[PDB]
Amino acid sequence: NPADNYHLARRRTLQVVVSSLLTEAGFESAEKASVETLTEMLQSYISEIGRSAKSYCEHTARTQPTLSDIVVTLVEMGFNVDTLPAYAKRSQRMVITAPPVTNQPVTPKALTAGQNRPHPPHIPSHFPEFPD
Amino acid sequence: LPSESMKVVAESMGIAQIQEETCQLLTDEVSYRIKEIAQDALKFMHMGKRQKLTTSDIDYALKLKNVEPLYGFHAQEFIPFRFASGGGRELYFYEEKEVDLSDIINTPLPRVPLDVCLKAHWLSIEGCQPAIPENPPRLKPRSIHELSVEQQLYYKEITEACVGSCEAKRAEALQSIATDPGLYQMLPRFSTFISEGVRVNVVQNNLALLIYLMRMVKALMDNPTLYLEKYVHELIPAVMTCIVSRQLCLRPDVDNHWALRDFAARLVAQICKHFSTTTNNIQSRITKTFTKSWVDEKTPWTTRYGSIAGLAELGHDVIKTLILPRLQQEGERIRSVLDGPVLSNIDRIGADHVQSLLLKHCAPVLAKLRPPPDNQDAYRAEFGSLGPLLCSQVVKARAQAALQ
Amino acid sequence: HGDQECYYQDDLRVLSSLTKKEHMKGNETMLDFRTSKFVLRISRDSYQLLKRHLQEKQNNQIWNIVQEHLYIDIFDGMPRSKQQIDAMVGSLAGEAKREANKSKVFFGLLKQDPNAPPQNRIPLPELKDSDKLDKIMNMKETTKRVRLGPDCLPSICFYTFLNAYQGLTAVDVTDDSSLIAGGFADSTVRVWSVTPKKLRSVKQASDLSLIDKESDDVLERIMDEKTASELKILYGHSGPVYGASFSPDRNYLLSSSEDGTVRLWSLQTFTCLVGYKGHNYPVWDTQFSPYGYYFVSGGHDRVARLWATDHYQPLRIFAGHLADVNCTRFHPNSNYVATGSADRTVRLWDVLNGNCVRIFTGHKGPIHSLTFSPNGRFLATGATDGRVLLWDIGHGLMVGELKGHTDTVCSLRFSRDGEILASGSMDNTVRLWDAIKAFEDLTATGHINLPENSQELLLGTYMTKSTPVVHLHFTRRNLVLAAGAYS
Amino acid sequence: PKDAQMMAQILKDMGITEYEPRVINQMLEFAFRYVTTILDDAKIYSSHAKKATVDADDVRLAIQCRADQSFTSPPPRDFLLDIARQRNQTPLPLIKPYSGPRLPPDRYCLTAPNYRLKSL
Amino acid sequence: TPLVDFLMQLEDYTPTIPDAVTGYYLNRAGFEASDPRIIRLISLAAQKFISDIANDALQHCKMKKYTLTMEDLTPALSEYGINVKKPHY
CATH number of the domain residue C96 falls in: 2.130.10.10
Is some CB atom of chain C closer than 8 A to the CB atom of B114? Answer: yes
Which residues is C340 bridged to in the sheet? C346
In angstroms, the first-to-last Cα distance of chain E is: 50
Phi–psi pair at B157, nearest 5 degrees: -70, -40
Whole-number Å distance between alpha carbons of B88 and A41: 10
- B84 in helix, strand or coil? coil
CA distances from residue C382 to C297, C361, D8 in whole angstroms, order as listed: 19, 12, 31
Whole-number Å distance between alpha carbons of E82 and E85: 10
Note whether A30 and B105 are within 8 A (CB): no
Helices B283-294, B301-312: inter-axial angle, 10-degree rounding:
140
| Strands C156-161 and C480-483, sheet pairing | parallel
Whole-number Å distance between alpha carbons of C477 and C400: 27
Residue A37: its H or E element: helix A32-59
Phi–psi pair at B242, nearest 5 degrees: -60, -40
Is some CB atom of chain D closer than 8 A to the CB atom of B15? Answer: yes
Nearest CB neighbour to B119, from listed C156, C160, C482: C160
Q: Residue B12 maps to which CATH number? A: 1.10.20.10
Whole-number Å distance between alpha carbons of C165 and A6: 7
CB atoms within 10 A of CB A8: 19
Is some CB atom of chain A closer than 8 A to the CB atom of B71? Answer: yes
Interface contact flag, C238 E32, Cβ < 8 Å: no
Which residues is C421 bridged to in the sheet? C414, C433
Interface B-D, measured as beta-carbon pairs within 8 A, has a size of: 121
Residues 39-78 of A with CB under 8 A from E: 41-43, 45-51, 53-54, 64-65, 67, 70-71, 74
- Strand spans (E) along B54-155: 73-75, 118-120
Sequence-ordered list of residues with C-beta below 8 angstroms from that of C289, at least 6 positions apart, any chain: C295, C296, C330, C334
Q: How far is B79 from chain E (nearest CA, A)?
A: 10
Kindly list the strands in the beta sheet with C356-361, ordered across the sheet, starting from the edge strand earlier in the chain: C329-330, C336-340, C345-350, C356-361
**CA torsion, ordered B348, B349, B350, B356, to nearest 10 deg:** 110
Whole-number Å distance between alpha carbons of B227 and A56: 62
Residue A88: its H or E element: helix A84-88
Note whether E31 and E21 are within 8 A (CB): no
- D70 in helix, strand or coil? coil
CB atoms within 10 A of CB E61: 19
Interface contact flag, D32 E88, Cβ < 8 Å: yes
Whole-number Å distance between alpha carbons of C20 and C31: 13
Whole-number Å distance between alpha carbons of A36 and A43: 10
Whole-number Å distance between alpha carbons of C71 and B369: 87
How many angstroms from the chain centroid is the CA of residue D58?
25
In eight-state DSSP terms, residue B177 is H
Residue E83: its H or E element: strand E82-84
Maximum CA extent, chain A? 72
Residues 8-47 of D with CB under 8 A from E: 25, 28-29, 32-33, 36
Nearest CB neighbour to A66, from listed D106, D109, D115: D115
Interface contact flag, A28 B108, Cβ < 8 Å: no
B/e letters for C423-448, b = 16+ CB within 10 Å, e = fewer, are bbbbbbbbbbbbbbebbeeeeeebbb
CB atoms within 10 A of CB B138: 2
Is some CB atom of chain A closer than 8 A to the CB atom of C65? Answer: no
Whole-number Å distance between alpha carbons of D22 and B30: 18
Name the neighbours of E, counting chains with at least 3 Cβ pairs within 8 A: A, B, C, D
Interface contact flag, C308 D80, Cβ < 8 Å: no
Note whether C256 and C262 are within 8 A (CB): yes
Interface contact flag, B31 D13, Cβ < 8 Å: no
Angle at C192 between CA C186 and CA C196, to 5 degrees: 160
B/e letters for D61-75, b = 16+ CB within 10 Å, e = fewer, are bbbeeeeeeeeeebb
Nearest to D59 by CA among D45, D72, D42, D75: D42
Best probe of the C interface among E25, E26, E28, by most C CBs < 10 A, is: E28
Interface contact flag, C479 A127, Cβ < 8 Å: yes
B/e letters for C80-93, b = 16+ CB within 10 Å, e = fewer, are beeeeeebbbbbbb
Whole-number Å distance between alpha carbons of C302 and C318: 9
Q: How far is E89 from chain D (nearest CA, A)?
A: 8
Residues 117-176 of C with CB under 8 A from A: 144-146, 155, 157, 163, 165-166
Whole-number Å distance between alpha carbons of C369 and B308: 68
- B75 in helix, strand or coil? strand
Q: Which residues does chain E have within 8 Å of residue D3's beta carbon, measured at their own beta carbons?
A: 89
Note whether B211 and B257 are within 8 A (CB): yes
Which residues is C283 bridged to in the sheet? C299
Helix residue ranges per DSSP H, D6-108: 7-13, 21-49, 56-64, 77-87
Resolution of the experimental model, in Å, one decimal? 4.1
CA distances from residue C351 to A105, C10, C296, C311, D91 in whole angstroms, order as listed: 56, 33, 10, 16, 11
- E82 in helix, strand or coil? strand
CB atoms within 10 A of CB E39: 23
CA distances from residue A46 to B61, B119, C157, C166, E47 in whole angstroms, order as listed: 21, 33, 41, 19, 10
Q: Which residues does chain B have within 8 Å of residue C242's beta carbon, measured at their own beta carbons?
A: 47
Which residue of chain A comes nearest to C157, CA vs CA? A127
Note whether C212 and C220 are within 8 A (CB): no
Kindly list the strands in the beta sheet with C253-257, ordered across the sheet, starting from the edge strand earlier in the chain: C241-245, C253-257, C261-265, C272-277
Angle at B168 between CA B166 and CA B172, to 5 degrees: 120
How many angstroms from the chain centroid is the CA of residue B265?
17
Sequence-ordered list of residues with C-beta below 8 angstroms from that of C133, at least 6 positions apart, any chain: none
Instruction: Let me know if C120 is exposed, middle or buried by CB neighbors in 10 A (0-12, 13-18, 19+).
Output: exposed
Note whether C418 and C332 are within 8 A (CB): no
CA distances from residue D3 to B38, C293, D10 in whole angstroms, order as listed: 16, 55, 11
Whole-number Å distance between alpha carbons of A63 and A60: 9
Sequence-ordered list of residues with C-beta below 8 angstroms from that of B352, at least 6 positions apart, any chain: none
Nearest to C361 by CA among C107, C103, C100: C100
Whole-number Å distance between alpha carbons of C439 and C399: 7
> Which residue ranges make up each domain of chain D?
1-120
- E84 in helix, strand or coil? strand
Q: How far is B209 from chain C (nearest CA, A)?
A: 40
In eight-state DSSP terms, residue A76 is G
Instruction: Let me know if C352 is exposed, middle or buried by CB neighbors in 10 A (0-12, 13-18, 19+).
Output: middle
Q: Up-side HSE of residue C82: CA atoms within 13 Å toward CB?
A: 1
3-state secondary structure chain C: CCCCCHHHHHHHHHHHHCCCHHHHCCCCCHHHHHHCCECCEEEHHHHHHHHCCCCCCCCCCHHHHHHHHECCEEECCCCCCHHHHCCCCCCCCCCCCCCCCCCCCCCCCCCCCCCCCCCCCCCCCCCCHHHHHHHHHHHHHHHCCCCCCCCCCCCEEEEEECCCCCCEEEEEECCCCCEEEEEECCCEEEEEECCCCCEEEECCHHHHHHCCCCCCCHHHHCEEEEEEECEEEEECCCCCEEEEECCCCCCCEEEEECCCEEEEECCCCCCEEEEEECCCCCEEEEEECCCCCCEEEEECCCCEEEECCCCCCCCEEECCCCCCCCCCEECCCCCEEEEECCCCEEEEEECCCCCEEEEEECCCCCEEEEEECCCCCEEEEEECCCCEEEEECCCCCCCEEECCCCCCEEEEEECCCCCEEEEEECCCEEEEEECCCCCCCCCCCCCCCCCCCHHHHEEECCECCCCCCCEEEECCCCCEEEECCCC
Residue B53, phi-psi category: left (phi > 0), alpha (psi -120 to 50), beta (remainder): left
Sequence-ordered list of residues with C-beta below 8 angstroms from that of B302, at least 6 positions apart, any chain: B244, B245, B246, B247, B251, B346, B350
Note whether C383 and C342 are within 8 A (CB): no
Breaks after residues in chain E, judged by C–N over 2.5 Å: 64
Interface contact flag, D88 C125, Cβ < 8 Å: no
Whole-number Å distance between alpha carbons of A117 and A95: 56
Looking at residue D77, its amino acid is: R
Note whether C266 and C309 are within 8 A (CB): no
Sequence-ordered list of residues with C-beta below 8 angstroms from that of C92, at least 6 positions apart, any chain: C11, C29, C33, C36, C322, C343, C344
Domain containing B37 equals 3-65
Looking at residue E60, its amino acid is: H
Helices B347-368, B387-403: inter-axial angle, 10-degree rounding:
50
Whole-number Å distance between alpha carbons of A27 and A25: 7
Is some CB atom of chain B closer than 8 A to the CB atom of E30? Answer: no
- Strand spans (E) along B55-176: 73-75, 118-120
In eight-state DSSP terms, residue B125 is B
Is some CB atom of chain D closer than 8 A to the CB atom of A40? Answer: no
Is some CB atom of chain A closer than 8 A to the CB atom of B80? Answer: yes
B/e letters for B43-69, b = 16+ CB within 10 Å, e = fewer, are bbbbbbbbeebbbbbbbbbbbbbebbb
Whole-number Å distance between alpha carbons of E18 and E36: 11
Whole-number Å distance between alpha carbons of B307 and B298: 14
Whole-number Å distance between alpha carbons of B175 and C65: 75
B341 preceded by cis ω (within 30°)? yes
Kindly list the strands in the beta sheet with C480-483, ordered across the sheet, starting from the edge strand earlier in the chain: B118-120, C156-161, C480-483, C471-474
Whole-number Å distance between alpha carbons of C245 and C234: 14
Give the method used: cryo-EM
Which residue of chain D comes nearest to A61, CA vs CA? D110
3-state secondary structure B212-280: HHHHHHHHHHCCCCCCCCCCHHHHHHHHHHHHHCCCCCCCCCCHHHHHHHHHHHHHHHHHHHHCCCCCC
CB atoms within 10 A of CB E74: 17
Helix residue ranges per DSSP H, chain E: 2-7, 19-27, 36-56, 59-62, 70-76
CA distances from residue B28 to B34, C9, C21 in whole angstroms, order as listed: 10, 23, 15
CB atoms within 10 A of CB B202: 18
Q: Which residues does chain A have within 8 Å of residue B172's beta carbon, measured at their own beta carbons?
A: 110, 112-113
Nearest CB neighbour to C161, from listed B51, B116, B135: B116
Q: Which residues does chain C have within 8 Å of residue A2's beta carbon, measured at their own beta carbons?
A: 163, 165
Domain containing C81 equals 1-100
Nearest CB neighbour to D15, from listed C13, C300, C302: C13
In eight-state DSSP terms, residue D76 is P
Note whether C373 and C106 are within 8 A (CB): no
Q: Is the dihedral of CA C47, C48, C50, C56 positive or negative?
A: positive
Whole-number Å distance between alpha carbons of C421 and C430: 10
Concatenate the DSSP letters of all residues of B295-344 into one string. S-TT--HHHHHHHHHHHHTT-HHHHHHSSGGGHHHHHHHHHHHHH-----
CA distances from residue D81 to C154, C319, D75 in whole angstroms, order as listed: 46, 7, 10
Nearest CB neighbour to E88, from listed B12, B74, B77: B12
Note whether D112 and A61 are within 8 A (CB): yes
Nearest to C261 by CA among C282, C285, C290: C282
